Design a protein around this ligand. Structure first.
Ligand SMILES: *[C@@H]1O[C@H](CO[C@@H]2O[C@@H](C)[C@@H](O)[C@@H](O)[C@@H]2O)[C@@H](O[C@@H]2O[C@H](CO)[C@@H](O[C@@H]3O[C@H](CO)[C@@H](O)[C@H](O[C@H]4O[C@H](CO)[C@@H](O)[C@H](O)[C@@H]4O)[C@@H]3O)[C@H](O)[C@H]2NC(C)=O)[C@H](O)[C@H]1NC(C)=O
Ligand SMILES: *[C@@H]1O[C@H](CO)[C@@H](O[C@@H]2O[C@H](CO)[C@@H](O[C@@H]3O[C@H](CO)[C@@H](O)[C@H](O)[C@@H]3O)[C@H](O)[C@H]2NC(C)=O)[C@H](O)[C@H]1NC(C)=O
Ligand SMILES: CC(C)CCC[C@@H](C)[C@H]1CC[C@H]2[C@@H]3CC=C4C[C@@H](OC(=O)CCC(=O)O)CC[C@]4(C)[C@H]3CC[C@]12C
Ligand SMILES: CC(C)CCC[C@@H](C)[C@H]1CC[C@H]2[C@@H]3CC=C4C[C@@H](OC(=O)CCC(=O)O)CC[C@]4(C)[C@H]3CC[C@]12C
Ligand SMILES: *[C@@H]1O[C@H](CO)[C@@H](O[C@@H]2O[C@H](CO)[C@@H](O)[C@H](O)[C@H]2NC(C)=O)[C@H](O)[C@H]1NC(C)=O
Ligand SMILES: *[C@@H]1O[C@H](CO)[C@@H](O)[C@H](O)[C@H]1NC(C)=O
Ligand SMILES: NC(=[NH2+])NCCC[C@H](N)C(=O)O
Lengths: 223, 546
């Protein structure tokens, strides 16, 4: 029968940061989850600058003077200045622009590795602190030149908006790093989503490759 | 092209002269601009690099003046030691340095004075003047800077000279004001301003188009810090006056290097303290565009202190201004008397007994530059000129150490393992060639590290290959210079590590020059084109040694 189904995307602390809902039979609705990469970082690792931000909180940082709202008191011109020195993070609009550039540059990007649902043979992939990406080959999906894929991983993660579509959204001081998560055939065949399955996401940059941990779970009720 | 010429005050007096001629617009006006635009709280680091780059240069001067019994500007030393073309380039760069320094300091003094009285002169300028070319010219011409330059040029023409007592008094007042600024920053200022985040990216004033950057201590990154250091090299200029003192010194060549180094160290300490105070009292982004230090004092509630600072700055900006003007006619007169420049510039007026025409021409050029170009543009132009001059001095120090005492085919064994105990003409030629190749290779290294910075970060094969080859071949050429014997001539002062320290000085100077803007490079290129035209059309044929 039909239930009110709800797919939830939660941060590393297992607090729901994004959600979508619909009336469907159980295990028949597999929508494209579009959480913001910054939403996953809310109350997350210190690098993203959102370790003290609650879920569903508004994007921090002053607006860009180039935004649709125009110039205002204390508006920032960093969104027009070069993004070279900027660190890819989510605490300001220009930092979000830098994060978008990093995730959209061919030589750079982000890669995702699976968590507790990975096979025992991958147990050498590290713990949550390592983001389950202790070494190359553990990654199962992500947007990067080597284009990783897995025949058993339950999701594939890519960039939802192209750079051009996202620059203006960033300059409007909105969440402007929307991921695109698509359930694989293996994921569609899986039923344990009620308990939640968790992945780690790390940026491919020249340095620490800082990352975070996110999760996808299912809730449902009668409708 | 390579024709060569035939050649009291205590150390504390030299230190006072250097400090008075160095402290000025760099700290009172430009420190806030650098801490707001290029660097943040990390401007303290920016000065440090700018200090070291200066010290490396100053040390060279100590040796570069030790090889000439006569005391004079770097132009005289070059024209006595290396050659005519090299000396002309050095003197032309010094002329640019002095002229643009006069222009920039006159502008800073005019802006400070106009601020002190409510910007009435600026209001008149906006009302009645406009250049209609913000892309390359100033938003508002500085008529008062022109007036100041005219008055000071008139004073200089009528025989006004350096008053040591007045310089000491003004330097003491400025140093007292700077110490007060440091103490007030350490008292009122807080470390939290060095740890700002997006929570604090707001200004009480409702100015727009702010650059907040990353925040914290290094909002704009190490690239921003390096650009700030290149700009802050403006502040450390002015120690050449110690080498060009002219007046008799207790130690002809031992006190001069000590005085230069002590002045540079004192200036670095003062700049570090004042910049730390400025960035601790007020947020780096909040720093007032018109007057950073008074704005920070007002932000902390000590508005009255704006008077004290006004007393200090106007003193420093005065001592610095003359420090950039008194040498200005001297270099032009020296070059003209030698025939490199137009001979009419060397005619000394009988009534005044001074080079009236050279002083008037230099003053007019400085007044026009101050009228037409912004403070930052003139600052960068003088910085590039002075950096090239200092690199030339360092190259002279590197070269002369291995040349034989004056009155082609080669072999690998001779080049790498010379057996002569003292330099020969072959060794001197090897060192000259190695210096040229090392200069070219350092230019290549800096170009790839600046222009190809992102490419190097990306790891592209061509950029990495070029950088690696250039750096390793720089090391190889430095070793080649190392193996050559040094001149046995005894010198009162020597650069300790002559094979490395001059090379590092050249590299740092060229890197800082690369940090500058494209417009600065275009202005410098046109100035150098004018200088080369003058030399090759007039200088070579009318030289006094011809
Ligand atoms: C089908 O189910 C969805 C989702 O169910 C929700 O999650 C379940 C796990 C369970 O806890 C349910 O109780 C819960 O409702 C329903 O959509 C939710 O509807 C409620 C209201 O009925 C929303 O509650 C909140 O109410 C606040 C005011 O009191 C309001 O400010 C909230 O908006 C803000 O917060 C939400 C997240 O809470 C955020 O998504 C918004 O964008 C906004 O910031 C919100 O309205 C829930 O938020 C709704 N969604 C979720 C994921 O909880 C849906 O109504 C239901 N439909 C039927 C026909 O049954
Ligand atoms: C993530 O990617 C999806 C897919 O590209 C985006 O969904 C798209 O959003 C745009 C803008 O809302 C939709 O355009 C609209 O189309 C309708 C007709 O369907 C038209 O009437 C509207 O005027 C508007 O042009 C587009 O249809 C929609 N596409 C899909 C497949 O859903 C989404 O916006 C991206 N961002 C996020 C946060 O999900
Ligand atoms: C109607 C106009 C003239 C009003 C504008 C104010 C003037 C009275 C100002 C503008 C420039 C000032 C001068 C700028 C610099 C100096 C140098 C200063 O001397 C030093 O600092 C000596 C240091 C050294 O010799 O190295 C003495 C004051 C003086 C002449 C100032 C005197 C007052 C002047 C002429
Ligand atoms: C006075 C004597 C006793 C010591 C002289 C030491 C100097 C030769 C050293 C001290 C600090 C050094 C500088 C420290 C940092 C840099 C930055 C470096 O460039 C980068 O690291 C760029 C990185 C980026 O691309 O962001 C180029 C050399 C330079 C200027 C160094 C040049 C050599 C310096 C001036
Ligand atoms: C920058 O902003 C932060 C957060 O607003 C300030 O930190 C808090 O300030 C409040 C006062 O407004 C104090 O009560 C808290 O104890 C501070 N710390 C917290 C909340 O962790 C900080 O003071 C601001 N800094 C500056 C220089 O303005
Ligand atoms: C802030 O803006 C108001 C007008 O909205 C203006 O009156 C005020 O002077 C501004 N604050 C300044 C200039 O410090
Ligand atoms: N001798 C010079 N060229 N000096 C020009 C002025 C630079 C001086 N260091 C200042 O702080 O303003």
């Amino acid at each position: 029968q039909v239930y009110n189904i709800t797919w939830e995307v939660t941060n590393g602390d297992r607090e729901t940061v994004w959600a979508i809902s619909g009336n469907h039979p159980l295990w028949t609705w597999w929508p494209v989850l579009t959480p913001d990469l910054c939403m996953l970082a809310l109350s997350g690792p210190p690098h993203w600058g959102l370790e003290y931000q609650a879920p569903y909180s508004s994007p921090p940082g002053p607006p860009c003077c180039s935004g649709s709202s125009g110039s205002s008191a204390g508006c920032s011109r960093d969104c027009d200045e070069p993004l070279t020195s900027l660190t890819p993070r989510c605490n300001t609009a220009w930092n979000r622009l830098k994060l978008d550039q990093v995730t959209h540059k061919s030589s750079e990007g982000f890669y995702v590795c699976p968590g507790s649902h990975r096979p025992r043979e991958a147990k050498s992939c590290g713990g949550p602190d390592s983001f389950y990406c202790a070494s190359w080959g553990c990654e199962t999906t992500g947007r990067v030149y080597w284009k990783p894929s897995s025949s058993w991983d339950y999701i594939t993660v890519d960039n939802n908006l192209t750079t051009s579509q996202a620059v203006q959204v960033c300059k409007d001081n909105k969440w402007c790093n929307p991921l695109a998560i698509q359930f694989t055939n293996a994921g569609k065949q899986v039923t344990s989503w009620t308990t939640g399955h968790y992945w780690g996401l790390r940026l491919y940059v020249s340095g620490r490759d800082p990352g975070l941990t996110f999760g996808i779970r299912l809730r449902y009720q009668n409708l | 092209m390579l024709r060569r010429k035939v050649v009291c005050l205590n150390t504390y007096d030299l230190v006072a002269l250097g400090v008075g001629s160095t402290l000025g617009a760099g700290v009172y006006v430009l420190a806030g601009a650098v801490a707001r635009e290029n660097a943040g709280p990390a401007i303290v680091i920016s000065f440090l690099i700018a200090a070291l780059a200066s010290v490396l240069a100053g040390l060279c001067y100590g040796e570069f003046g030790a090889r000439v019994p006569k005391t004079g500007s770097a132009y005289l030393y070059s024209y006595v030691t290396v050659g005519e073309l090299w000396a002309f380039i050095t003197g032309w760069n010094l002329i640019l340095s002095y002229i643009i320094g006069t222009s920039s300091v006159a502008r800073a003094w005019s802006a400070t004075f106009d601020e002190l009285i409510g910007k009435p002169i600026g209001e008149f300028s906006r009302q009645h003047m406009a250049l209609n070319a913000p892309g390359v010219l100033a938003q508002t011409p500085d008529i008062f800077a022109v007036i100041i330059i005219i008055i000071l040029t008139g004073l200089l023409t009528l025989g006004v000279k350096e008053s040591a007592m007045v310089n000491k008094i003004f330097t003491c007042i400025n140093v007292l004001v700077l110490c007060f600024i440091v103490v007030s920053g350490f008292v009122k200022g807080s470390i939290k301003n060095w740890q700002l985040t997006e929570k604090n990216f707001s200004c009480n004033n409702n100015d727009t188009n702010v650059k907040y950057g990353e925040g914290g201590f290094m909002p704009f990154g190490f690239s921003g810090v390096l650009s700030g250091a290149a700009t802050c090299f403006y502040a450390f200029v002015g120690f050449d006056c110690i080498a060009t003192t002219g007046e008799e010194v207790k130690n002809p060549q031992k006190a001069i290097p000590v005085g230069i180094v002590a002045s540079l160290l004192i200036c670095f300490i003062a700049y570090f303290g004042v910049s730390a105070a400025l960035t601790l009292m007020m947020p780096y982004f909040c720093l007032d565009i018109d007057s950073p230090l008074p704005g920070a004092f007002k932000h902390q509630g000590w508005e009255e202190a704006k008077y004290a600072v006004a007393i200090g700055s106007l003193c420093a900006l005065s001592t610095s201004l003359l420090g950039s003007m008194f040498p200005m006619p001297r270099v032009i007169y020296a070059m003209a008397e030698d025939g490199l420049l137009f001979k009419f510039l060397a005619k000394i007026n009988n009534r005044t007994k001074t080079p009236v025409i050279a002083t008037v021409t230099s003053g007019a050029i400085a007044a026009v530059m101050a009228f037409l170009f912004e403070l930052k543009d003139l600052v960068d132009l003088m910085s590039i000129g002075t950096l090239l001059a200092y690199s030339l001095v360092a190259a002279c120090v590197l070269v002369l150490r291995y040349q034989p005492e004056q009155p082609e085919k080669f072999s690998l064994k001779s080049i790498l393992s010379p057996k002569n105990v003292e330099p020969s003409k072959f060794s001197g030629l090897i060192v000259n060639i190695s210096a040229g190749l090392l200069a070219a290779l350092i230019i290549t290294v800096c170009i790839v590290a600046v222009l190809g910075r992102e490419a190097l970060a990306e790891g592209t094969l061509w950029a990495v290959f070029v950088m690696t080859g250039s750096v390793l071949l720089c090391m190889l050429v430095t070793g080649i210079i190392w193996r050559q014997p040094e001149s046995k001539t005894k010198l009162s002062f020597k650069v300790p590590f002559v094979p490395v320290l001059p090379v590092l000085s050249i590299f740092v100077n060229i890197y800082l020059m690369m940090q500058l803007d494209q417009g600065t490079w275009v202005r410098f290129a046109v100035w150098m084109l004018i200088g080369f035209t003058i030399y090759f059309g007039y200088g070579i044929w009318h030289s006094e040694e011809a």
